């Protein structure tokens, strides 16, 4: 079933891997790939999603650099090493809900701009919480493996 | 359908039964068995007028008339007084809630007109004076069910809930 999720995990990672100029931000992402995947399946998806966005520190040019990453390949994530890493993982999760048609791409892209709609995004993900958590597993587990392999210490 | 009416717990005597025979059916709103009185109705914005225990509408949210709304129709007489109100029972403020009501409840309340004779300055009337504390049970509680004053050692608690639950306001003018 999820044979094309190891593919998706490779394009999503190669995007995050490049919009992480600072080396300490890659290492910080490798820390998110290991940890965040293991709270989604012990604490739940949206309890971990809330934790992700709260540490992501949205509402900046960052929140619009994400929108560019969906299509562009020259976008960059700037901010705290702990912020770019947590926000880069928010991309990873959202990049999947787009490419798999769980969340409409047009909704998500305009919900990432209109402040009034972000609450409706979190409200949509709450009802898609059981469905999402099942599908992303193979995808996130692959992202975890790619991180430990590709993100190396100098 | 389920006809119900309001009778509350003041110091006055006009509240003795104030309304003729109960529904005849086995349904009521208020339990009396284990923890004393249950599901005491509280209506806000009304006072008792120290006599003729009817509820003149005030405006402030501080005025209480705590009583036991029960099943029945008012006095089988002139309907010049009572509210004749219907509500889905999710819209009457009960206290000490117990086994849940689920249907619409047509209720009758001892309503008086605003009586625009002069100012209405309410006077909080707490319940005391043990002699009437039993008289209240003797004139109200023992008849509404009759499972009390006959087979209850729980009469002791009904002596206490009146001096603990019901506390209201009155114009006294």
């Amino acid at each position: 079933l999820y044979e094309e999720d190891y593919k998706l995990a490779l394009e999503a990672f190669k995007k995050v891997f490049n919009a992480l100029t600072h080396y300490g931000a890659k290492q910080a992402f490798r820390s998110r790939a290991r940890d965040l995947v293991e709270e989604i399946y012990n604490s739940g998806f949206i309890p971990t999603f809330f934790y992700i966005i709260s540490k992501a520190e949205l509402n900046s040019d960052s929140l619009d650099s994400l929108i560019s990453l969906f299509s562009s390949d020259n976008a960059i994530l700037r901010g705290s090493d702990e912020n770019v890493s947590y926000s880069a993982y928010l991309f990873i999760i959202l990049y999947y809900l787009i490419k798999r048609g769980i969340i409409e791409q047009k909704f998500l892209i305009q919900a990432l701009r209109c402040e009034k709609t972000r609450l409706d995004l979190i409200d949509k993900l709450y009802n898609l919480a059981p469905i999402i958590s099942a599908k992303i597993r193979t995808y996130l587990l692959a992202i975890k493996r790619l991180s430990e392999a590709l993100i190396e210490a100098r | 359908s389920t006809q119900r009416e309001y009778v509350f717990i003041p110091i006055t005597n006009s509240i003795t039964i104030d309304v003729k025979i109960t529904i005849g059916g086995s349904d009521h709103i208020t339990n009396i068995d284990e923890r004393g009185i249950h599901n005491v109705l509280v209506i806000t914005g009304y006072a008792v007028d120290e006599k003729n225990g009817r509820l003149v509408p005030t405006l402030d949210p501080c005025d209480y008339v705590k009583g036991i709304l029960v099943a029945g129709t008012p006095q089988q007489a002139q309907s010049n007084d009572f509210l004749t109100l219907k509500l889905p029972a999710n819209k009457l403020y009960l206290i000490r809630k117990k086994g849940n009501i689920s249907d619409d409840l047509k209720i009758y309340i001892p309503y008086s007109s605003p009586d625009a004779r002069n100012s209405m300055k309410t006077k909080p009337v707490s319940i005391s004076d043990d002699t009437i504390v039993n008289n209240i049970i003797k004139e109200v509680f023992d008849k509404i069910y009759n499972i009390t004053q006959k087979e209850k050692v729980k009469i002791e608690k009904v002596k206490e809930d009146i001096k603990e639950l019901f506390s209201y306001y009155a114009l006294e003018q």
């Binding site: 079933l1 999820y2 059981p130 469905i131 099942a134 599908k135 597993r137 193979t138 | -």
Partner: protein, 285 residues
């Protein structure tokens, strides 16, 4: 006809099962289960008969000749046998389920595919002509399910959506509205498409690694690691026991088969991997 009667039964795994097959398949398993023509676990008729015949000779040592007449007479005497087992066919494998409130909540469910239910129907049609104790109360149920082939189905439960084995989201449809369930356990039975079911079923199969430890240094030996495959508890295999017309089989089917409730099949009994339960579909129907 010389197949006077046929006695189908369900093989219910009380513990995990391991009926071995050498190293016949690839995946990564060194000691895999016995497969069939399309990859599901089966119990071969040789292993199922030999296990029941090795059992039941210790259980009823006085009736050794009644069993020899029916089940083979393993000695050098070679009179023909009177009883035949068919390969045990995977009927339903347990699956962890997360349903979206969707129900009175369940934690696990039985999962079948339409491929597996065709072979059960094939076995059921084939003996209806001699079983004058016609179990059409069961054969019809498979017929209605097979009529609804081409979509995920829930027989008696009303879920409409669930997550099977933490990985597969499926939407379910009632049979038509309702029908009695086969397994009397208070557990729903899902019948999935053959593509989705083959993934959900392969996820219920237990594939463990096992270790041999150097007892003096408490570390694993060199090459002391291997892999095995077990069939979970509560799994259900369906098979038939065909009997030729004789007087020994009348005793065997009446005296011996009534008292078989638990037997031991397969290997690795030291790990407790063989306790299974037979249910004799003539009373559960």
């Amino acid at each position: 006809p010389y197949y006077a009667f046929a006695e189908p039964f369900f093989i219910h795994a009380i513990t995990h099962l391991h009926v071995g097959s050498g190293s016949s398949v690839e995946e990564e398993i060194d000691l895999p289960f016995q497969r069939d023509e399309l990859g599901y676990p089966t119990i071969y008729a040789s292993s199922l008969k030999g296990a029941i015949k090795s059992f039941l000779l210790k259980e009823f040592p006085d009736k050794r000749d009644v069993i020899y007449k029916v089940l083979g007479e393993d000695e050098n005497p070679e009179e023909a046998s009177l009883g035949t087992f068919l390969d045990a066919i995977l009927f339903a494998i347990p699956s962890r389920i997360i349903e979206i409130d969707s129900a009175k909540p369940y934690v696990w469910v039985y999962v079948t595919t339409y491929e597996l239910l065709k072979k059960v129907k094939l076995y059921l049609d084939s003996i209806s002509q001699l079983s004058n104790a016609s179990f059409s109360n069961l054969k019809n149920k498979i017929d209605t399910i097979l009529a609804k082939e081409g979509k995920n189905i829930t027989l008696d439960s009303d879920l409409k959506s669930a997550i099977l084995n933490e990985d597969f989201y499926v939407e379910l449809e009632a049979l038509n509205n309702k029908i009695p369930s086969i397994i009397n356990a208070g557990v729903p039975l899902l019948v999935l498409e053959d593509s989705i079911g083959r993934e959900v079923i392969n996820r219920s199969l237990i594939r463990v690694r096992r270790i041999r430890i150097d007892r003096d240094k408490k570390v694993v030996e060199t090459g002391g690691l291997w892999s095995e495959e077990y069939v979970p508890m509560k799994t259900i295999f369906f098979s038939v026991l065909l009997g030729k017309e004789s007087k020994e089989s009348a005793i065997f089917a009446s005296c011996i088969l009534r008292n078989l409730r638990y037997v031991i099949l397969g290997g690795k009994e030291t790990i407790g991997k063989g306790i299974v339960e037979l249910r004799w579909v003539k009373d559960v129907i």
